[PDB]
Amino acid sequence: LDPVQKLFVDKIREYRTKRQTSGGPVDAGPEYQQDLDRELFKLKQMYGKADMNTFPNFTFEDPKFE
Amino acid sequence: FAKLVRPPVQIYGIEGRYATALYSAASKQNKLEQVEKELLRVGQILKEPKMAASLLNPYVKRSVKVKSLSDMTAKEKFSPLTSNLINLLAENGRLTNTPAVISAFSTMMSVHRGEVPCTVTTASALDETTLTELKTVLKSFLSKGQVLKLEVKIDPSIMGGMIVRIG
Amino acid sequence: EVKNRLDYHISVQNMMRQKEQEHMINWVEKRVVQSISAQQEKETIAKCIADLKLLSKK
Amino acid sequence: TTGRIVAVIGAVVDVQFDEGLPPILNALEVQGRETRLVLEVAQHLGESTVRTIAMDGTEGLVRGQKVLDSGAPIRIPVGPETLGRIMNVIGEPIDERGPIKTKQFAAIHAEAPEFVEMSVEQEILVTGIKVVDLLAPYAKGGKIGLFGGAGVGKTVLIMELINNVAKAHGGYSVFAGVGERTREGNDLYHEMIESGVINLKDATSKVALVYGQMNEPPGARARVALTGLTVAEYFRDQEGQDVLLFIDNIFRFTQAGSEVSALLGRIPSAVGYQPTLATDMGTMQERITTTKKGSITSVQAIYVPADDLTDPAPATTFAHLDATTVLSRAIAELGIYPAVDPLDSTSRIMDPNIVGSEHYDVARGVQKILQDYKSLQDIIAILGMDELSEEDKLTVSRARKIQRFLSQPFQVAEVFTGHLGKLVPLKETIKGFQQILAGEYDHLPEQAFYMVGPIEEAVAKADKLA
Amino acid sequence: TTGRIVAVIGAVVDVQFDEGLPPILNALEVQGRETRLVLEVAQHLGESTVRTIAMDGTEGLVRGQKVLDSGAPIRIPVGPETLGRIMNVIGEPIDERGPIKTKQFAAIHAEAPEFVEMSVEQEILVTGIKVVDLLAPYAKGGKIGLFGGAGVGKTVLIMELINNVAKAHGGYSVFAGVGERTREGNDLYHEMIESGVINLKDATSKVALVYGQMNEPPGARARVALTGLTVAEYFRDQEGQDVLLFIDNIFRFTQAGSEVSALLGRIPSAVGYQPTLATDMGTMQERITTTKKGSITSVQAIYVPADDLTDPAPATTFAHLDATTVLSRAIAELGIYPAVDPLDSTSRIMDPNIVGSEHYDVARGVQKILQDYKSLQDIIAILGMDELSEEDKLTVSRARKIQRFLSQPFQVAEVFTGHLGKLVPLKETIKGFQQILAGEYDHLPEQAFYMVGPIEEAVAKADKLAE
Amino acid sequence: DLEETGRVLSIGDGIARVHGLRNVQAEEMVEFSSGLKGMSLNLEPDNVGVVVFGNDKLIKEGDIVKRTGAIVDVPVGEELLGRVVDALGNAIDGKGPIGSKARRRVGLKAPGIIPRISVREPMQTGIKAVDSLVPIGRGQRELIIGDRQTGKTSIAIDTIINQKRFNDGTDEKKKLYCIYVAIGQKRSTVAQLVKRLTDADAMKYTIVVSATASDAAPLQYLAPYSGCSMGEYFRDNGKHALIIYDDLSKQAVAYRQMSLLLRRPPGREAYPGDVFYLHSRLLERAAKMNDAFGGGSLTALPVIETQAGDVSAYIPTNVISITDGQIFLETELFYKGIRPAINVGLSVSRVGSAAQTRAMKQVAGTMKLELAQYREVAAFAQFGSDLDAATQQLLSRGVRLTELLKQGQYSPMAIEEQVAVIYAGVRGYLDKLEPSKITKFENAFLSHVISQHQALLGKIRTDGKISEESDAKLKEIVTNFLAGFEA
């Protein structure tokens, strides 16, 4: 997260300023939002379009052999 | 075959077979610097279409060349062995090459004439000295803050890894 | 079937931080990379440390 | 800045740039040339001399002549508006529908998408060609490399598929005529127009054309592939798209590489080879993919140099394949168009897995039977099968029948074939073999199985015969 | 003199020797070496630069690095102390049993002893291995090539020979496991220890182990051959002994040479082999001898590259050989062990006098029949295999018996086989075949003959088989 | 800094002729301004030929080349297990970093004789054929030789998966840390592969060293050596590792190229000569140590893909000359379906028995033998069609045995089971039945035994051998199972 103090002081300082804001963590930026929504689609494909907030359920059966 | 003065590096090939020749020749009797300048002079005395006329066409026959680059280099007086070696490189084709040959010998931002180390900036030490890590401290007093886009800009440079830590 | 949507939400927020990280970074760095340069004295620190090499290496 | 022609030996233009000396791959535009005479830097030879490769042709270039580095790789117009359009290598429409109003440019180096980024779940791209699906099943996103002899309907096939497939498709397609017969491109043009898939009131055809035909000068041909990759990545990644990418012919890429190799002062590997065939390949190949972000379903024409596969080039290639299409001249000699040999033409994605075992097994019996048969023909070559077991005779004939049954008319090349195209959905495919395999059929003529559509058609034909 | 590494281009170390040079072939020691880097001088490239050959790995080395010439070629430990010792090229106790308290050093360039020194007569060395003696009667002191391509128990066989022979004589050994798998040398190792023929309690054995495995500088590996030679010559004459010299694998030597040849600037001629191929061998083989004051019965394992002997190298090799064992991988594929090629496995020195005519003839007849049989093969593959004409059948079968009888159990690969190895001294053998030749056992059938030592055992085996 | 920095004398081809760096350590891995690493192969008098690990569109001349001052080591640990790494030991699995923060030199040479102890352990794959007929031990080296995606890889995989049960053992006699070198193998393939392991999650005990297709040539080159160091690590920690080199073939190609780029001559088969040394030395590092070194092992499964079965393909020839046997795969059987597709008549483990369990030995000796004739009886009195019962039996039996060894794509197994089923046929018990039912049977038989004769299985496994009793247990069991198969 942190190394070279001579740059680092300013650089890290600007990063925290981000966190210290709630119009986004200082801003967000369209570009990210566009990709987010895309990437969000894809991984739903990755593991099917059910919603794993709920779990599966099954049904039951039998037949006579002879 | 003779063991020779081969003050190292010294680029042994490369127009420096000759340089290394004179790194034993010149140094024998150490007529080095004197001759260094012979060479310098010559440098443009040649390289004009005038001495280097035979450069212009070597069709002119090498004999002619050793009789026009001078009867030696003969017209002048750059000749200790200078002329004989001229009259050799000529024939030996190393004439069009000569600046570099001269360089190789000479020129010594570092080579028995000076020094050059760097991590940051032109840090052309220049000095035949035994040390320089002071003679840099020195230099850092012609300045010590100034610009430093007069060579190293350590600004991007070191500013390189960090961009890596993030990724 | 449960797990993957939970892990998706986390994984997206993770992916969504890194991108914000590079883009955040890029603005912060592409702004302040410029300003620094006024410090002559990092070249102050170059020489200083450079003496603690030039002297202090050998 | 500017450079000097210091040496021109062919399209290896030795440029001394001093003034700058950008990295390698910086595109230079020659001053004193009306042409956008690109040389793309190849080596920094030193002496601030670079070896560049003119992509382009040369001539009329007085040495020393000034070259101004354009300072970057080929940046080429991008955007969906490339569909329809035939652009040359340098991305200018050679469809000449005026220019293109790009959106952006791209350096035609595009890289390897990430290992971590891939989605990689091969699913059959069906084709409706019995022979294909069954034997050389294709996967959606798959890279199929079409080994095939010259003119063997190799091209035909690919096209034929394109019709069959690219139509059905929802993603786009790219046709890269790399080193292709311009003529064939002309032809191609006209079908595409005709077909209206290239609908020309549509730069929103389902297909973008990039052509860097046979005629180009080497560099152009060499690099055009990279370009094509770059485009498709645009459509995939950027436009989502499952691209079907027609390359005719990657061989010419290869060719081009090797051709230059010499001039690239190399030690050029065997046969003169570019040893950087390998690197080239990797570097290309990895650009080739089917990301998480979609597919480049990659239809790679591979001329089989001297039809030698053994030939390192293809040999390497195989590694990158996923579906291999070997059109087999022997078979071709057997007249067959289809001319494939699937003991050769194999698909990694041909698996009991990916495409069912039925396929596999029905095939394994076939592959087997054929494999055995293949063993037999030679003994038979002497002996005939005459004093050699009848079951074998049967089976052989069956194998062959199956062979014949694989012969399948071309709808496109009805002109060529006479025969009228056939396309057979899977089931009837299965069925077919299963039946023939059942020997059920076998009381029948071999040639009945020839150039059929579904088995019925063989049946139909049987009647028509006998 | 002193040298500077002027160029390290791979492990080709070009040294510019500064204070002059040392002569050719001088072993040079690099100054600044934790494991002295013997350099073998190869060319005086001139400019007091030599091209030298690294005989170690070249890692870590500072260019320029200082070399002090050992003032000689490679000189190596020599002395009786090598018996039961594993030496490397540079003699080093790679037995890892502390330094060899050798009492002599030698430059490993041993050369060709003179014409006059050569015992003009040798006596057939009998191996008691039927086939061996029979077709290639070996002579004590002989140069035996074991051509054989890879893997076929080849090494096993070889070892076994060692068992059979080296034990059995006051003949000493040098075993040079050159280029061999360190692993196989290990394995091998254990066997001797085990055998007690490497008996270490008295360090001595009678055996020098010289190893120069396939992880060593080729030149070095190349040179480990010389090393052994140099040593053995010492034992040969000086110790007077018939040393048995096992070289595994002289092909790899040649190879090692070839790999470097390029680098040595020699254009390594056809099939890649060094253009100096001839000299390399010539000098080597000519270095080898059985003189009058001793024998180096030289057993050279020869890998047959690709079973191609027409491969120039083996082709050359052949010249030097005077007894050739060409093991036939096909025969091996025919499963045998005796897997040999028999109708190629010769000694030009088979004789109606010297092996007596009986032997000789028997062999010749046999060889003939096999050759004939071979002819019959031509019918059979496609035209019948318990089927055609019958007199020929008679021979076919006979040949076949002969084959089986030619097969003999492996005597340590009993571990694998469960077949106790066998061996048949010469007469019973000759006779043996004569009986078969006599067509005696014709009432008797084939498989009874398989993998036996003497014929009785086959007779016995028949009986077991009649159930 | 100075001196042991260089200005790129010339660059092209990722071959930096480097001006300066002169007092450099031979084969020092150097460091680029780009941060790419390179290796100092050729110290020429007036340049340093440096192979650039990366690529040179990314750089240009005069550039500072700085020594790293290090001759290559690679991170080593064992936190490579569960990891896919690149040669430099860096995630490419992209799973954050690796836990292998030790580094260990690649160029470390092979040990001596003395630190070894030869094999006497078996090594098992679950592949009946393998384990039986070319029975393998641990620390070994054996060639997987074959052509393309025959499940080319599969072979390794299933084996690895198979080791899972052993890794589910708590041994270190069978608990086998698996090392997969991917040479030249496009990421996609690799991905699948990784995935396969993942799915199998055998990956947990597994390094996958992956130099895919991509990689600048040295990278693929290096990888094995890397893997090697990494494997020596286990070996010296008594641990038994298996490294699969798949394949040097591609490597060699690259290497030649590398040489060529080094302006060194194309050697034999246009391949330079000490590519032999290359691999030879590489491969010498695979071993079974003696006990002092914890007895550990690095078992090597190099893979070489022949091109057209060409083994006189120089490098194959070489490798063969190295190999302790080779596992030859043939197409035909494959096409026939038959996987095994092997020609065991061309596959060998010279070794045979050190590499075995008595259990296996008990059926296999005989079987091998039987197959030998069986195969043989295809050639004498047959090139393809003829009859007689005695022998017909042998054929029948043989055919059965074929099935019995016929082990389709994907099949990790445990040996006693294998023996179990094998025993049935060997001991002639199903000869009757058709091949088709064998498999089915086999399966069936398996759940049966698995369940029931789990007892028995316990035993056989235990005895390492089947006792006569256990045999008897089989005899009735099998007979009955067969019977059950009916009855």
From Swiss-Prot, chain B:
GO terms for cellular component: mitochondrial inner membrane; mitochondrion; proton-transporting ATP synthase complex. Acetylation at Lys-139 decreases ATP production. Deacetylated by SIRT3. In response to mitochondrial stress, the precursor protein is ubiquitinated by the SIFI complex in the cytoplasm before mitochondrial import, leading to its degradation. Within the SIFI complex, UBR4 initiates ubiquitin chain that are further elongated or branched by KCMF1. The chain holds residues 24 to 190 of 213 of the full protein. This is ATP synthase peripheral stalk subunit OSCP, mitochondrial. The modification N6-acetyllysine is found at residues 31, 37, 47, 50, 77, 135, 139, 149, 153. It is found in: Mitochondrion; Mitochondrion inner membrane. Its main location: mitochondrion. GO terms for biological process: proton motive force-driven mitochondrial ATP synthesis.
UniProtKB/Swiss-Prot annotation, chain C:
GO terms for biological process: proton motive force-driven ATP synthesis. Its main location: mitochondrion. GO terms for molecular function: proton transmembrane transporter activity. The modification N6-acetyllysine is found at residues 30, 42, 53. The keyword Ion transport applies. GO terms for cellular component: mitochondrial inner membrane; mitochondrion; proton-transporting ATP synthase complex. Keywords: Acetylation, CF(0), Hydrogen ion transport, Ion transport, Membrane, Mitochondrion, Mitochondrion inner membrane, Transit peptide, Transport. It is found in: Mitochondrion; Mitochondrion inner membrane. Component of the ATP synthase complex composed at least of ATP5F1A/subunit alpha, ATP5F1B/subunit beta, ATP5MC1/subunit c (homooctomer), MT-ATP6/subunit a, MT-ATP8/subunit 8, ATP5ME/subunit e, ATP5MF/subunit f, ATP5MG/subunit g, ATP5MK/subunit k, ATP5MJ/subunit j, ATP5F1C/subunit gamma, ATP5F1D/subunit delta, ATP5F1E/subunit epsilon, ATP5PF/subunit F6, ATP5PB/subunit b, ATP5PD/subunit d, ATP5PO/subunit OSCP. Belongs to the eukaryotic ATPase B chain family. This is ATP synthase peripheral stalk subunit b, mitochondrial. It comes from Bos taurus. The chain holds residues 192 to 249 of 256 of the full protein.
Curated annotation (Swiss-Prot), chain E:
Its EC number is 7.1.2.2. Keywords: Acetylation, ATP synthesis, ATP-binding, CF(1), Glycoprotein, Hydrogen ion transport, Ion transport, Magnesium, Membrane, Metal-binding, Mitochondrion, Mitochondrion inner membrane, Nucleotide-binding, Phosphoprotein, Transit peptide, Translocase, Transport. It is a peripheral membrane protein. The modification Phosphothreonine is found at residue 254. GO terms for biological process: proton motive force-driven ATP synthesis; proton motive force-driven mitochondrial ATP synthesis. It catalyses: ATP + H2O + 4 H(+)(in) = ADP + phosphate + 5 H(+)(out). ADP binds at residues 151-156. Its main location: mitochondrion. Phosphate binds at residues 151-155. Glycans are attached at residue 48. It is found in: Mitochondrion inner membrane. The modification Phosphoserine is found at residues 357, 375. Transmembrane segments: none annotated. Mg(2+) 2 binds at residue 180. One of its GO terms (molecular function) is proton-transporting ATP synthase activity, rotational mechanism. Pfam families: ATP-synt_ab, ATP-synt_ab_N, ATP-synt_VA_C. It comes from the Eukaryota. Homotrimer. Component of the ATP synthase complex composed at least of ATP5F1A/subunit alpha, ATP5F1B/subunit beta, ATP5MC1/subunit c (homooctomer), MT-ATP6/subunit a, MT-ATP8/subunit 8, ATP5ME/subunit e, ATP5MF/subunit f, ATP5MG/subunit g, ATP5MK/subunit k, ATP5MJ/subunit j, ATP5F1C/subunit gamma, ATP5F1D/subunit delta, ATP5F1E/subunit epsilon, ATP5PF/subunit F6, ATP5PB/subunit b, ATP5PD/subunit d, ATP5PO/subunit OSCP. Belongs to the ATPase alpha/beta chains family. This is ATP synthase F(1) complex catalytic subunit beta, mitochondrial. It comes from Bos taurus (Bovine). The gene is ATP5F1B.
From Swiss-Prot, chain F:
The modification N6-acetyllysine is found at residues 57, 60, 66, 95, 101, 164, 173-174, 195, 239, 361, 368, 432, 440, 465, 473, 475. Mg(2+) binds at residues 153, 246. InterPro entries: ATP_synth_asu-like_sf, ATP_synth_asu_C, ATP_synth_asu_C_sf, ATP_synth_F1_a_nt-bd_dom, ATP_synth_F1_asu, ATPase_a/bsu_AS, ATPase_F1/V1/A1_a/bsu_N, ATPase_F1/V1/A1_a/bsu_N_sf. It is found in: Mitochondrion inner membrane; Cell membrane. One of its GO terms (molecular function) is ADP binding. Gene3D superfamilies: 2.40.30.20, ATP synthase alpha/beta chain, C-terminal domain, P-loop containing nucleotide triphosphate hydrolases. GO terms for biological process: proton motive force-driven ATP synthesis. One of its GO terms (cellular component) is mitochondrial inner membrane. The modification N6-succinyllysine is found at residues 95, 101, 164, 173, 195, 239, 361, 432, 440, 465, 473. Acetylated on lysine residues. BLOC1S1 is required for acetylation. The record marks 347 as: Required for activity. The modification Phosphothreonine is found at residue 68. ATP binds at residues 149, 151-154, 407, 409. Glycans are attached at residue 10. It is a peripheral membrane protein. It holds the Pfam family ATP-synt_ab_C. The modification Phosphoserine is found at residues 10, 40, 100, 118. Keywords: Acetylation, ATP synthesis, ATP-binding, Cell membrane, CF(1), Glycoprotein, Hydrogen ion transport, Ion transport, Magnesium, Membrane, Metal-binding, Methylation, Mitochondrion, Mitochondrion inner membrane, Nucleotide-binding, Phosphoprotein, Pyrrolidone carboxylic acid, Transit peptide, Transport. Its main location: mitochondrion. The modification Omega-N-methylarginine is found at residue 138. Belongs to the ATPase alpha/beta chains family. HAMAP family: ATP_synth_alpha_bact (MF_01346). This is ATP synthase F(1) complex subunit alpha, mitochondrial. It comes from Bos taurus.
